[PDB]
Write a protein that binds this ligand. Structure first.
Ligand SMILES: [Ca+2]
Ligand SMILES: [Xe]
Length: 240
């Protein structure tokens, strides 16, 4: 996250770190949202590489003992059947991970609540992106969970020529684009949290930023629109 602030330890208890095996260590690659005690929602592009994955819940600092972490292997990966790795602009950038164990819920570990199906946020709806992604374009991962205030940019504006043009779809949510704050590499798969009727819900799964850089004016961060995938999600969990 570029231009973020450090999240308090208990603000975003559904945020997870998706990690892969590198040597005999694990390295953070992507964010995710805990949606069942044994299921995580992330971005399809995060799980294209044939890698060993683990999920960390109750994670705050990637390189320090928080005293709150649970570490759980990924047992099954279900990527959206329509996802095409060579065509992120087509959408469908979403995947579900079944965990090898069911995690224990507490103030640091909670299920993320999803919006009602078909819900579209009004232009300029206030949201926070969260994650451990790069803090600068071509920079380094954050050590501690970051959050940034990123207001939505509706489809009409986001798909206009100054913005993302034909690249963005109605299956996506754009947020931010002020040139100061944004998602960045390593935030992919993580949540966009938006307050609706007094409660946060996870409206986005972080998908992409400009190839020109993370925080680029009129290139808001783009997210898979969660409310487009409600029946897909439920169908996968009910059959697995
Ligand atoms: Ca930690
Ligand atoms: Xe990203």
């Amino acid at each position: 996250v570029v231009g973020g602030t450090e999240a308090q330890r208990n603000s975003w208890p559904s945020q997870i770190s998706l990690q892969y095996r590198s040597g005999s260590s694990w390295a953070h690659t992507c964010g995710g949202t805990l949606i069942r005690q044994n299921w995580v929602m992330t971005a399809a592009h995060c799980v294209d590489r044939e890698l060993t994955f683990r999920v960390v819940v109750g994670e705050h600092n990637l390189n320090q003992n928080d005293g709150t972490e649970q570490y759980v292997g990924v047992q099954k990966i279900v990527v959206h059947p329509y996802w095409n790795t060579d065509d992120v602009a087509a959408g469908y950038d979403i995947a579900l991970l079944r965990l090898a164990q069911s995690v224990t819920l507490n103030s640091y570990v909670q299920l993320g609540v999803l919006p009602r199906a078909g819900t579209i946020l009004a232009n300029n709806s206030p949201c926070y992106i969260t994650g451990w992604g790069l803090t600068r374009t071509n920079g380094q991962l954050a050590q501690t969970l970051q959050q940034a205030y990123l207001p939505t940019v509706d489809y009409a504006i986001c798909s206009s020529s100054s913005y993302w043009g034909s690249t963005v779809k109605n299956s996506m949510v754009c947020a931010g684009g002020d040139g100061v704050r944004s998602g960045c590499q390593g935030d992919s798969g993580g949540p966009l949290h938006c307050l609706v009727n007094g409660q946060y819900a996870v409206h986005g799964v972080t998908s992409f930023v400009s190839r020109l850089g993370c925080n680029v004016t009129r290139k808001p961060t783009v997210f898979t629109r969660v409310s487009a995938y409600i029946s897909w999600i439920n169908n996968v969990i009910a059959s697995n």
